[PDB]
Amino acid sequence: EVGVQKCKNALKLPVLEVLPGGGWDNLRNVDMGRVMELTYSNCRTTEDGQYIIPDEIFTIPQKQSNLEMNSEILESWANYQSSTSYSINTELSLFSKVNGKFSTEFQRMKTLQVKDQAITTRVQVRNLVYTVKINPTLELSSGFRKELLDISDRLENNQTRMATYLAELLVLNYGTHVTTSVDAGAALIQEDHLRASFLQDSQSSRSAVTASAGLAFQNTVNFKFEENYTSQNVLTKSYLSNRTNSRVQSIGGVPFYPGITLQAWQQGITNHLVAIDRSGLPLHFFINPNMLPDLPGPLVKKVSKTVETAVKRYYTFNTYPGCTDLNSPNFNFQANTDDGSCEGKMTNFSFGGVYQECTQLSGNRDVLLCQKLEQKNPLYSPVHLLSQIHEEGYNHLECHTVCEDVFQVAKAEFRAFWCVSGLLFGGLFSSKSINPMTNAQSCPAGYFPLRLFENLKVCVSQDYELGSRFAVPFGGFFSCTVGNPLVDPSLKKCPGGFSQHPALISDGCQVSYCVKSGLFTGGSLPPARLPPFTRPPLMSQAATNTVIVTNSENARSWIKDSQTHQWRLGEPIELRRAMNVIH
Amino acid sequence: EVGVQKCKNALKLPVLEVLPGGGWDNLRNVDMGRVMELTYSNCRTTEDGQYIIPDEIFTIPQKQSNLEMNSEILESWANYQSSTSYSINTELSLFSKVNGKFSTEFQRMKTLQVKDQAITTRVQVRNLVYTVKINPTLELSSGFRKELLDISDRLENNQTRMATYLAELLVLNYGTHVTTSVDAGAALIQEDHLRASFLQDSQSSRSAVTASAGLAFQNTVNFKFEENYTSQNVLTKSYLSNRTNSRVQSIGGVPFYPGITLQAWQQGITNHLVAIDRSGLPLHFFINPNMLPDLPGPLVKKVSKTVETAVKRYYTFNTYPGCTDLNSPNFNFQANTDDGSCEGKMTNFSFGGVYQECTQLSGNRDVLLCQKLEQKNPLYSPVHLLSQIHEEGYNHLECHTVCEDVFQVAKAEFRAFWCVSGLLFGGLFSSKSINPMTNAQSCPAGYFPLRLFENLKVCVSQDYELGSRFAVPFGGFFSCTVGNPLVDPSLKKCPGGFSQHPALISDGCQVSYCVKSGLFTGGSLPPARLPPFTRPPLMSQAATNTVIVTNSENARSWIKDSQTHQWRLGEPIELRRAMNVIH
Amino acid sequence: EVGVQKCKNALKLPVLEVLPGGGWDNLRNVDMGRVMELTYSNCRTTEDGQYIIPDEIFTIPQKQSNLEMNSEILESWANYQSSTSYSINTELSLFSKVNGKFSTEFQRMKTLQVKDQAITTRVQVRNLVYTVKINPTLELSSGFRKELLDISDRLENNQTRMATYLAELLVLNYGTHVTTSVDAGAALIQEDHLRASFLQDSQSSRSAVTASAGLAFQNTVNFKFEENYTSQNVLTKSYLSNRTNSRVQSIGGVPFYPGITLQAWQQGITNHLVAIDRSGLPLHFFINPNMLPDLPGPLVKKVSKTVETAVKRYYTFNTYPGCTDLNSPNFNFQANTDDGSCEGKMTNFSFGGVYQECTQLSGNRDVLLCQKLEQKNPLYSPVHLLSQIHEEGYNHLECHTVCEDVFQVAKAEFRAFWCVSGLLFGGLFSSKSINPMTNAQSCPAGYFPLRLFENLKVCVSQDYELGSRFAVPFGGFFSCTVGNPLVDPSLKKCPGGFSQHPALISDGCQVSYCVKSGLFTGGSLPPARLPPFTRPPLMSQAATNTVIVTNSENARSWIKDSQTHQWRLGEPIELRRAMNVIH
Ligand SMILES: *[C@@H]1O[C@H](CO)[C@@H](O[C@@H]2O[C@H](CO)[C@@H](O)[C@H](O)[C@H]2NC(C)=O)[C@H](O)[C@H]1NC(C)=O
Ligand SMILES: *[C@@H]1O[C@H](CO)[C@@H](O[C@@H]2O[C@H](CO)[C@@H](O)[C@H](O)[C@H]2NC(C)=O)[C@H](O)[C@H]1NC(C)=O
Ligand SMILES: *[C@@H]1O[C@H](CO)[C@@H](O[C@@H]2O[C@H](CO)[C@@H](O)[C@H](O)[C@H]2NC(C)=O)[C@H](O)[C@H]1NC(C)=O
Ligand SMILES: *[C@@H]1O[C@H](CO)[C@@H](O[C@@H]2O[C@H](CO)[C@@H](O)[C@H](O)[C@H]2NC(C)=O)[C@H](O)[C@H]1NC(C)=O
Ligand SMILES: *[C@@H]1O[C@H](CO)[C@@H](O[C@@H]2O[C@H](CO)[C@@H](O)[C@H](O)[C@H]2NC(C)=O)[C@H](O)[C@H]1NC(C)=O
Ligand SMILES: *[C@@H]1O[C@H](CO)[C@@H](O[C@@H]2O[C@H](CO)[C@@H](O)[C@H](O)[C@H]2NC(C)=O)[C@H](O)[C@H]1NC(C)=O
């Protein structure tokens, strides 16, 4: 009787199913959450008189219908068009070469080009109908507003590392962007993968290749699967023979089956409309004093700085520099960002060994952390590489039968070294990784592991006749703070010929290691690594109540009242009586 | 008149049958339970106006329809795609190489590749319709909330080993994950199994193999079973002759029969939609102070640590390291995880014998446990391998005719040894296993059993002329705490050439044994071993009432009131009057 | 019961969907916002009796239908007709050569001509129906009026750099123009791309080329896709062979499919009408004392000067001077504006290095900005090029447990130099750009970066044997204030042979740099750079209340009352009593 169903009973019209305002993940092109609030109170319609739209939504009739007769050749996977999220992946940002490179449509296309030495062609029937946009005066959703107040409460009780944790659960549920405009329509695409040596002789007749690819697309749709085709004349005999893959997907409308008139596909697009393009803005753009009137001024500029840090950390991880030229050696298959590390010679290095010590600062009673946090050399110059503090909580139970239990914490800082007539290297495996020497979390035969950063193992053998089959050279560790001195004989990268691999993200700082195997390189493409990148804190910090919030340079002060009402602006006679009881 | 039927009478629409929120087992890809609460109060619909959805559910119209013309070749069973649970099996976890490897679809595919030396190809018509997701603000179900309170009660009456038992009945009923997003659709798949020597000569024309496999798939669907096919031209004469198996399964829609137009299959998908992909989060992620407001803070971080231990124990069991290379010898067929134990030489070892002693600490009266818990040598260096305590309860009946009965417990710790001119080895069989030397729970001819770990038998014969037909060599016992010293002449694995096998899980710790038979290896694939991995306790621990719960480091205290009301936060004037009567 | 639905129930007529009054972006031909208010109170109709129009709207029946039998040849992309926004892109302005050159239809056409050496021909069926215009007496919208009052409030509290920021969020949401008249209709266009050497021999028979192009267009529409064509006689055998691309788009009406009678397309245009031409006026034209009666006179002439500056800044950026002649060398592909920089010789220049110093004026406590704002020479005459001040805010927390937090600001002015036996040049990459030497944000091998303008890196190597593969020459920096002295051996442009590229827009002033690579030139076309071009201010300026507003030269004064009522005109007896308490 309220909301949609009140409008839907009076009008008896469908609701437009393609709406802006939701969140958007831009590494993996998926949408998530609902940032903006959508209400159906005035019973608005599209001025066709055909759909029902919310109140803060205006549509623009496009009624456009493209129809292409030539496929387009896109040879490299580095410059990637998306066909559904092209306007939002190509924004001007620092990470424009990482957007969209963890999606379903991209990971298939990179696989089919590398494993077959192939080039791809697509041809398309696109058919845009509306453009749906949001008004500039707009209200946040009920569930998204409550999660911004919780980050503000943790920042005003001096609880960092809990506000940081709640900011990374905001990226996980709402993405990195907000879509401000979509495009309702229905596409129909065919992608083929031709052998790359079929293009190189037909450099003059490249226009004859793509003319037959768009010719075969309209035989596939118009003719039923039995061969009544009109394309097999001259070069639709090697086009069929140099191709390595073919698929046809429809995105809106009715489902596609071979042999359906393009007349009949285009008459089922009504009431089956999806978003075939979209654009938007980053997520921290919508955190400003205009959208949040209840909080003070400089407090929402501190929440918006926390969310901006969590988004940029999510792009800093899931970024793999390496070599990208396919015909060159040292080709890294997991790398999504070029480095210039191609055509670079190598030089062998000898590492003496790794060792690890612990400190055991506070928790001397009832918990002994400083036995597994220590690792000594099985057999140069060591480097420190990390200063990491490990905290653990335990439980007493004082009984008196009534009892009580108290929870302490136990700190133990550890230090992990490596030496710059030497131990061999057999790979690494962690609690989120495997060793690709064995395709399993095990060192090979003869090798023995030893812990280095409290979560991963270091496959090492001291021999020179039996473990020489799995021995791969080593290039050096570095971190987010200290680069290795092996490059520039500093910078944070591998030397030439080597490739880096992530290992052991530890509280907003990952360390890396350089190898030269060729076996760590290949395999399947890695998935995206989702936030939170930190385990939850133990609530060890005490809450410090803040009552008055001020800034010095325009003489504005916000006084929180009793009862936790709200934040009102401080009149200059009440803050005069509130600072004496404070100071 | 309430719930679904109120909405269903007014709207007269079907309910969408593919919903998130339920649990999910990730070793065996099955779903179980219902973790989240789903209510039908606002009578929401999908904005098509076609289905009825719950209140805390938003759908995303995809309306996509893939159609592939080439089969895909996947040669090894180690890297396994699932076609229905691919997004959730490939999560970043420690056990990513164990997910999905106890399901129906996997165990068939591993069988057909090993027993035939075959490779598999699949081709597919996929047709995704909606994407159904859950809101981030969400309530737990009524039945799942009551089972989390019962684990908290056992932890606050100092009843460990009963809270551990109730946590493993939570994994049995609700799985290891919670699905947060599903994909409603309908697939149509054909899998074939070609001989592996048919690929190796057609390395150049591998693109001609897969083009005919996708050609035969559309003759099978479009043509009725009588041969009107258009594929038998050149190489659809050995493709039919090198294949070893073929099946066609449909997953949604109407049932498949040979000869049905793809037009007609795609018009029955409405109202017959199933989940063709899903993704989710682990089960202990949803146990936090946000979801459970009634319990104290550090108490639900102790329940969530108990459930995380029970899930990781369920992946630690059902994990079989071994050799995986098929053409290599020492191939273990039951192994689902590689080890590097391939291409390893063997060395014979002589074991003197096993013997077992008991202690009989407490139950000296009316129960004699220390006669069957003892086993002496029928005929080096012994090792202890286990310190296990065995508890049994009995019953007095004091009569006075009125009577009364009291229940005691009887403890008897046992120790089980083995010796590091020697007894022969004929296999083992237990109360959950058989001896594969006989395919039965019996020692072979000449062999006599003797107990070792109070539940299994040790087939042993002292002869050298008659029991030499069933004698297999022996590689050594180890446990979850002590590895054997026979490897690295320590580590917890077999030496080279040998294979390990589970035996006698005893209270969260299994022991293993290394053999070299080739007969223990083969057979059928083992099923998953389901929790609980411990028999129920005898309630021997006394309940210790806890009233006040505090943590030291933010000065918060929770005071339980009388009557077992609930846990309220302790004001600093009531805990002042509650600690004096306590301490 | 009000608005549209009251008129729509009584009349039972559709609403005309093509209306003026909305905003319009003129670089990218898209429409956005709604500047004018549209009300449906009198229930007016089009005097056909066919549509429903708003009250302040008059339509003109055209009922015209063009039909062309010859394609038109447009060879160069510099003079670009738009076919949907031709009347509004060709206005008399300073930036008439930049209008429409960031749209979807233009960027495709520039790509297909450069990459193929092609010329384009279009043929069209146009069919104009109405002309819809706005009355001269007209009211602003509710949402656009509220955003003009907010710019006026920031200008009367002496808050510049916040009123400048709110003016650039007005261009982002409402564009650069307002459409005052549209044209409802439905076009049907075919564009082809012929090889440019096919025109040059048929200079006499250019009329035979375009006669067959309009002949093939009516075989495509009238005949179904099977070849029943009547065009293949003499020169529809090389016209089919010299063409490189072909598409057919419809803009209004029903969707196009090959084989539909032109009879049948022209009977579906009713109720499917879109804007096929439009014209309008700039956005600051509609900010005058007539439209805003509440504000004073000289105050709305100050708001309208602020918005005019933000629009002209948006055209000053997104303007790329360079070479445009395609067959000439030094061809810049990203350039949209000619320069005369073609056919110009080059001269090598040696730059010693770049260095950077900081000042740290105010924020000496708790924040050290003057360590990363400094960069020293790794190894002439330096020039200053910029004087930029960097402000950052921090947070104290004075505790007393009650606490309070104060927000300061920290200023640190920096200076960035470059020298007019020399460092090599390897490219630049920034926080909104990449290095095109690597197609990634990385310096090549041997090169090391060093910061220059607090956001970008300068790829530099001091060697002469290894980094000679990626070394490109350098032409000099300049800015919006200082041109380089290398041209005219001043002007703000490159010397001959070089090309400029944008880098580091910093608060309404960009700096540029001249290179000569040929690799920085190519690639994909850049998207439009959208406002705001400045990060939000930190509210450091104090609000200065203004009460009376006067101008000297007609003796008019506006007195703001109490309560923030409004601005009334000052009677000469109240301002007499208001200036004494003021002065
Ligand atoms: C507010 O939180 C910060 C962050 O932890 C506290 O700063 C640290 O406090 C510890 C405790 O003495 C010191 O050992 C560290 O050196 C401090 N680090 C920094 C960067 O200041 C701070 O003390 C807290 N303030 C209050 C009043 O609790
Ligand atoms: C893949 O493409 C190449 C073209 O580069 C094909 O090679 C030609 O095939 C035709 C077929 O009759 C021959 O007449 C030519 O002599 C071949 N060579 C050249 C240089 O054109 C090749 O056949 C294609 N692959 C398959 C399997 O057909
Ligand atoms: C709470 O339960 C624990 C777990 O059993 C008890 O700890 C054991 O108690 C027995 C009985 O004296 C001792 O022999 C063990 O050595 C204890 N083990 C550990 C690890 O502490 C504990 O005593 C119980 N507390 C109360 C008050 O009943
Ligand atoms: C299994 O595949 C092999 C191909 O590796 C088939 O062997 C070929 O069969 C054709 C059939 O006429 C012969 O002409 C070839 O000479 C055979 N050998 C090779 C190397 O191509 C084999 O026939 C297939 N199995 C069955 C049962 O047909
Ligand atoms: C009104 O705003 C202007 C703009 O900032 C102020 O002018 C500057 O004020 C600072 C502060 O003393 C001076 O250092 C600058 O030299 C001034 N610049 C110019 C161009 O005047 C102005 O002072 C403000 N007026 C009031 C009353 O606050
Ligand atoms: C592209 O256009 C040129 C015309 O400039 C074509 O060249 C002529 O092709 C015809 C076809 O039989 C020949 O008779 C002429 O001798 C060719 N030359 C001239 C100067 O007219 C060329 O063939 C076209 N391209 C394609 C692929 O057909």
Swiss-Prot record, chains A, B, C:
The keyword Membrane applies. Forms arc- and ring-shaped pre-pores on top of the membrane at neutral to slightly acidic pH conditions and converts to pores upon acidification. Undergoes transition from the pre-pore to the pore in a processive clockwise hand-over-hand process. In the pore state, 2 alpha-helical regions refold into transmembrane hairpins (TMH1 and TMH2) in each protomer that form in the ensemble complex giant beta-barrel transmembrane pores. The record marks 325-326, 330-333, 568-569 as: Cleavage. The chain crosses the membrane at residues 86-93, 100-105, 208-217, 221-229. Residues 3-318 form the MACPF domain. Pore-forming protein involved in both innate and adaptive immunity. Plays a central role in antigen cross-presentation in dendritic cells by forming a pore in antigen-containing compartments, thereby promoting delivery of antigens for cross-presentation. Also involved in innate immune response following bacterial infection; shows antibacterial activity against a wide spectrum of Gram-positive, Gram-negative and acid-fast bacteria. This is Macrophage-expressed gene 1 protein.
